[PDB]
Design an enzyme around this catalytic site. Structure first.
Site, PDB file in Angstrom:
ATOM      1  N   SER A   7       6.689  36.136 -16.196  1.00 48.98           N
ATOM      2  CA  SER A   7       6.901  34.746 -15.810  1.00 48.98           C
ATOM      3  C   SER A   7       7.298  33.882 -17.022  1.00 48.98           C
ATOM      4  O   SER A   7       8.269  34.193 -17.687  1.00 48.98           O
ATOM      5  CB  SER A   7       5.681  34.241 -15.034  1.00 48.98           C
ATOM      6  OG  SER A   7       6.081  33.139 -14.221  1.00 48.98           O
ATOM      7  N   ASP A  64      10.856  37.096  -5.523  1.00 50.12           N
ATOM      8  CA  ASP A  64      10.232  36.064  -6.313  1.00 50.12           C
ATOM      9  C   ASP A  64      10.895  34.723  -6.004  1.00 50.12           C
ATOM     10  O   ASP A  64      12.115  34.597  -6.068  1.00 50.12           O
ATOM     11  CB  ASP A  64      10.412  36.400  -7.787  1.00 50.12           C
ATOM     12  CG  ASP A  64       9.420  35.701  -8.665  1.00 50.12           C
ATOM     13  OD1 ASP A  64       9.069  34.518  -8.394  1.00 50.12           O
ATOM     14  OD2 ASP A  64       8.945  36.277  -9.658  1.00 50.12           O
ATOM     15  N   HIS A  71       6.431  36.981  -6.868  1.00 54.04           N
ATOM     16  CA  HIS A  71       5.726  36.656  -8.093  1.00 54.04           C
ATOM     17  C   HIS A  71       4.261  37.047  -8.111  1.00 54.04           C
ATOM     18  O   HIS A  71       3.721  37.381  -9.179  1.00 54.04           O
ATOM     19  CB  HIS A  71       5.771  35.155  -8.322  1.00 54.04           C
ATOM     20  CG  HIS A  71       5.760  34.785  -9.767  1.00 54.04           C
ATOM     21  ND1 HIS A  71       6.918  34.645 -10.494  1.00 54.04           N
ATOM     22  CD2 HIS A  71       4.741  34.531 -10.617  1.00 54.04           C
ATOM     23  CE1 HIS A  71       6.613  34.307 -11.733  1.00 54.04           C
ATOM     24  NE2 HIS A  71       5.301  34.228 -11.831  1.00 54.04           N
TER      25      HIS A  71
END
Lengths: 573, 575
Positions: A437, A516, A548
C-alpha cells in the site's frame, strides 16, 4: 525453497484474534483469522462458535449484551463494496442480509441492538447512516473518512479525517441526524466514548503528549478530563489507542508511547502483557483485551494475568527465527529521529540481508505489534527494518502531519535514512525495500528517486499514480488523496513514481490484488507498460478475486509468497 | 499444500536431462544437459562429464564428427533471444571466445564443419543463412522464412525451410559462394536432411498420412525414392521422420515415428531401442548411441541396442509413482477426424479425477511418448493430463499438420475441446482445466473466450494474445510465420485473437509471461490484462523478470511452472 513456503504458510496460518465486544448476554465477540479466513466467533470459556457462513471482513461494534452481530462482508470479490449481514447470536451460521443497505465501502459502525449506525463511502459521498425499524436514514454527509466510535442514547460520537490530516470529533443524533464537527487547534482526536453525562470523552493527541478531554456536544466546550487514579496522566502517553466506558461505569483507556501500550481503568494502571492492546471489555466481571507483540500474533487475554483466552500459538521454530528486536532512532536528513523497529533474523548473519519493510497508511506505525510480513522475512533469513517515517502515528501530531502535502518527500528521506542506518550500524550486508500500500508506494518512490540505495524492491498494492488513482477513487479516497497531496496537481503528478520510471535501475517485484479499490490495478498496468517500454527489469504478480483487504489465508500466501521468493532470489546474486 | 507442490515442481525441473548433439574432441560425446540448474554443454568420455561452457547456454551448434571445438549459442539479451555464438576449444573446457563477427540475432540453427560455422538467424529485416570462416562472416542467402541448417558436406549445405503454407522445403546453398536452391515437393514436406557421400541430399518426406525417404540431387532437383538394404524401415510404415544422418562409416541412421513413439534404423534395419522417442543417432566406440525419452523418462543418453543408460537423471521414487501410466487415445472431433491424444494418468488423482488438458505449443509440435515436465508436475499435483494432438500437430502426416493453416482458433481448438469432452465422457475427468504454453497458451485463451463453460479454469503461459500487435512487434521470421498460420488474412488475425473476445470469458484465468519474450511478446499481454480488468474478469498474472520464451534455468522454469500448478491446485479446492 519449499521451506520458505512452509514457514510463510505457517506464519499466515497461525490464528489471529481481535476483540470486538460482548454479545449474546455475556459472551465474547471476536474476529479471528482462523480456519483459512476471517470469521466472527463467540467465545464463552471453551470452544469458539462460528457466527458467519462465508468469510467476512469485520463486524460492527456491538453494544454490550446484544443478541446479534452485524457482519461486514465484501460482496465485490475484494473491491470492498460491502453488505451487512446480521446473525442472531442464538442462531449461529444463519445470516440475513440487511438489504436496505446497498453495497458500499463500510468504514465503521456500531450496533445498539435496535439501530445499526455506520459510516460508508460511495462514489458520491461519505456518510453516516442509521438503519433501524423505520429503515435506512442518512444522518449526515461527512467531508471525508469518518468512523463511528460510540452511541449512547440518542448521541452518536465519531472521528473524522475531515481536513489537513487532522482528526475531528463529530457527533450526530440517532433520531434526527445532523452533524456537529469539533476540531482541536492542538491536535487530533484519536478515540471517543460518550460518558453517562452525555458528553464525549476523547483522546486528544497533540504535538507531543496525548491527554483525555471532555467535549460537551452542546457548545463544543473542551476541558481536560481528570481521572481518580493518576497512573494514566503520569504515564504521559503520546497516543491514545482506544477508550470506552465499561458496563460498571469505569473508563478503560489504552494509551501508548514508543510502540508499546498500557491499559488504565479510571486512570489506574492495569498490568498487561508487553506489546500492544486493543479494546478492553468487561466479561463476567473480569477485564479482557487483545494483545499483540512482534513475537505474539494478536490474541485475547485476561487482565491483569495475561492468561490467554484465545491464542494462535506461534510455533517455537518460527519464534526462534526472530533472534532479536530493537527500537532504534534513525537520524534522518533534517535531524528528525525516526523511531524504527528492527528484527534481527536468527537465520541471517550480521551483517546480513536486510529488508526495510515500509508500513502502509501512511497513518499507521511499526510498533511492538505482530507483523506477519516482518516475521516471514525473518523466517526467510532477512533482518527487518521498519521505520516510522513522518506521517506515522504513535509519535505525536507534528510527526504525523509532516507528511501532509509532501508524499514522496520527507517520509522517503526517513525510509532512506533507515536504509543508511541499517548499513552503517553494521546490521545490513545488503538492503532491500518492501512494502504494501503506502509501503509499496514507498518502494516505487525509492527505486525511482533513490536508485542504487536498495538492491531490489517489492511493491505490493502500491500507489502508482495519485491522479489516475484519484479519478478511480470513491468519495472517501478522493478526499484522502486531496489531504495527503495538498490538493495540488503538481504534487499529484510529480510525486507519482510512474512519472519517474526512467530512473529505475533495480529489480522490482510488483504484487497487486486485481480488485483493489484503494490502490487500483489500472495505474499499475500502465506502470508495467512503462517498465516494459523502457527496458526495465520487473516481475508482477496479480492476485485474482482479491482486493486491498486480505481476508483468506490463501490470498495472504498469494501476496506474500512472491515477495519472499523474489527477495530470496535476489539474495543469491 | 503449496510447499509439497514446490518440492515436486522443483525436483521434476531439477532432474538431469540430456540431449545428444554429436561427437567431438576426437571421440567424446557432445551433450547438452540440463544439470546443476541450467542448460550447459558437456563432453562425455565414458566416465565423468566435462562442462564446456561457463554461464548457461541455450544450445550448441551441430558439430562435424571429431572437430576439436564447440560453438555455444547464448542469449545475451536477458531472454529476447538475441544470441551470440561462443567457441570453446574442447581441449580447453570453460574458456569461451565470443565470435564478435556475428552480431546478436535469433540463431535458429547451425552446424560447425570445423572450418566454418554455418547458421541461420533471424533479424528484424531478414532470415538469412550465414557462414563464418577464417575469412570472416558472409551472408550466403536470404531465406523466405524460418530455415534450419540440416547438414554440410564439402561445399554443399542442406537445410529445411518453412518458406510457405506451413510446408517445409529443402534448400541447399554453397558454403564458399552462397546462393540458394529451394526444392519443393507437391506430395508433402521435407522433415530431416543429410548429405550422402555421393553429394545427394537424403531427406525425410512427410506426405499426407505417411513418411518415406527420398534422394534429392541439388544440381537438377531430381527426386527419387531411397531404397535401403533392409526393409524394416519400409515395413515400419512411419508417419514421420524425427531425424536422419549418415554416420562416418556411410551407413544411414534414421529415427522415424508412429503414434508418438520412434524407432531406430541403420541402413533400414531395426536397431532395438527403449520404448518412447529418440533423437540423433551417433556412432561412438563402435556402438550406436542416441537420446531416449518417454512420458516417464527424462531425456537421457543411451547405447543401442542394449538400451543401457550412459547419461541419465534419476527421478525420485515418489514422483515416478505419481505417473500411474500413459496411453494414446483417438478422440473424435467436430468433423469425424481422430485426434491422437496422449493421456497421462495421475497415481495421485482418483478416476474420475481433476484433469488438465495440457495443450502443446508450436503449433508444429506434438504430444508424444516423451518426457514433459509440465505434465509430470501436473500428475504430481494430482491431475490427470490429456494432451491432444490437434490438427496442426506433427507426427501424424502432412495433411493433419497443414489443416491448421489459415485456421488458428478453429479446427485445432475443436480438437482440443473434443479431447476435453472425451476426458469427461470417458469418465477420466471429474473436472476440466486447460493449460498451455506458447501456442498452447493461445489455445487456453481461445478456449476460455470461444468455449466459456468448457473448462473450470485456464492457465496461459507465454501466450499468443493478438496476432495483429504481435505481428507489429515480430522479427522477419515471426512475421512470416504469422503470415503462414493466418493465411495472410487480416480478418483471421483479428477474429482469431482472443484479445477481441475477452467479453466472453467466464472462467478464472492465470496468465504467466516472461517479460522479455520476443516470440509472444508481453505488450499484448498487458493489454489483455487491461481488458480483463476493465471487463470485471477474474484473473491472475505472473510476469517473469529477465526471461523470455526459452527457459534455460531451473529458477526460470520454476517461475513459469509453479504458479500454474498453484493456480490449478487452488481451483480444485473450489466448486
Amino acid at each position: 525453497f519449499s521451506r520458505i513456503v512452509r514457514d510463510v504458510e505457517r506464519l499466515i496460518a497461525v490464528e489471529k484474534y481481535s476483540l470486538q465486544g460482548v454479545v449474546d448476554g455475556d459472551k465474547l465477540l471476536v474476529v479471528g483469522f482462523s480456519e483459512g479466513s476471517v470469521n466472527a466467533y463467540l467465545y464463552d470459556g471453551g470452544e469458539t462458535v462460528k457466527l458467519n457462513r462465508e468469510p467476512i471482513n469485520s463486524v460492527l461494534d456491538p453494544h454490550y449484551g446484544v443478541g446479534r452481530v452485524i457482519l461486514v462482508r465484501d460482496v465485490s470479490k475484494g473491491a470492498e463494496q460491502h453488505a451487512l449481514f446480521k446473525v442472531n447470536t442464538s442462531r449461529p451460521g444463519e445470516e440475513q442480509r440487511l438489504e436496505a443497505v446497498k453495497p458500499m465501502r463500510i468504514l465503521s459502525g456500531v450496533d445498539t441492538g435496535e439501530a445499526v449506525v455506520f459510516t460508508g463511502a460511495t462514489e458520491d459521498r461519505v456518510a453516516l447512516y442509521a438503519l433501524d425499524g423505520g429503515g435506512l436514514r442518512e444522518l449526515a454527509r461527512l467531508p471525508g473518512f469518518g468512523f463511528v466510535s460510540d452511541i449512547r442514547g440518542d448521541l452518536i460520537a465519531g472521528l473524522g479525517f475531515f481536513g489537513g490530516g487532522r482528526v475531528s470529533l463529530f457527533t450526530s443524533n440517532l433520531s434526527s441526524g445532523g452533524l456537529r464537527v469539533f476540531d482541536s487547534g492542538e491536535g487530533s482526536f484519536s478515540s471517543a466514548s460518550i460518558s453517562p453525562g452525555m458528553k464525549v470523552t476523547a483522546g486528544l493527541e497533540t504535538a507531543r503528549e496525548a491527554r483525555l478531554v471532555t467535549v460537551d456536544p452542546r457548545d463544543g466546550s473542551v476541558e481536560d478530563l481528570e481521572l481518580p487514579s493518576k497512573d494514566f496522566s503520569s504515564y504521559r502517553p503520546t497516543a491514545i489507542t482506544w477508550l470506552g466506558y465499561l458496563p460498571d461505569g469505569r473508563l478503560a483507556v489504552v494509551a501508548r508511547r514508543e510502540g508499546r501500550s498500557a491499559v488504565f481503568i479510571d486512570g489506574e494502571r492495569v498490568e498487561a502483557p508487553q506489546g500492544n492492546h486493543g479494546r478492553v471489555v468487561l466479561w463476567r466481571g473480569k477485564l479482557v483485551t487483545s494483545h499483540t507483540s512482534l513475537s505474539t500474533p494478536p490474541r485475547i487475554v485476561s487482565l491483569p494475568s495475561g492468561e490467554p483466552l484465545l491464542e494462535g500459538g506461534l510455533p517455537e521454530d518460527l519464534r526462534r527465527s526472530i533472534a532479536g528486536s530493537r527500537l532504534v532512532w534513525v537520524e534522518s536528513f533534517d535531524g528528525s529521529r525516526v523511531p524504527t523497529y528492527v528484527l534481527e533474523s536468527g537465520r541471517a548473519p550480521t551483517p546480513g540481508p536486510t529488508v526495510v519493510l515500509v508500513h502502509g497508511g501512511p497513518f499507521a506505525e511499526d510498533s511492538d505489534s505482530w507483523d506477519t510480513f516482518a516475521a516471514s522475512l525473518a523466517a526467510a533469513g532477512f533482518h527487518v527494518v521498519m521505520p516510522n517515517y513522518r506521517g506515522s502515528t504513535g509519535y505525536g501530531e507534528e510527526w504525523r502531519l509532516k507528511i501532509i502535502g509532501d508524499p514522496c518527500g520527507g517520509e522517503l528521506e526517513d525510509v532512506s535514512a533507515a536504509a543508511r542506518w541499517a548499513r552503517e550500524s553494521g546490521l545490513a550486508s545488503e538492503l532491500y525495500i518492501m512494502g504494501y500500500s503506502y509501503g509499496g508506494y514507498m518502494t516505487l518512490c525509492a527505486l525511482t528517486m533513490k536508485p542504487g540505495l536498495f538492491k531490489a524492491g517489492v511493491a505490493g498494492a502500491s500507489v502508482v499514480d495519485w491522479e489516475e488513482m484519484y479519478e478511480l477513487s470513491d468519495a472517501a479516497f478522493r478526499n484522502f488523496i486531496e489531504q495527503l497531496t495538498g490538493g495540488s496537481r503538481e504534487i499529484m503528478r510529480s510525486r507519482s513514481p510512474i512519472n519517474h520510471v526512467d530512473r529505475i535501475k533495480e529489480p522490482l517485484a510488483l504484487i497487486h490484488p486485481q480488485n483493489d479499490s484503494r490502490t487500483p490495478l489500472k495505474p499499475l498496468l500502465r506502470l508495467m507498460g512503462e517498465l516494459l517500454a523502457r527496458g526495465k527489469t520487473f516481475e508482477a504478480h496479480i492476485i485474482p478475486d482479491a482486493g486491498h483487504a486480505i481476508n483468506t489465508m490463501e490470498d495472504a500466501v498469494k501476496i506474500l509468497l512472491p515477495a519472499v521468493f523474489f527477495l530470496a532470489t535476489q539474495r543469491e546474486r
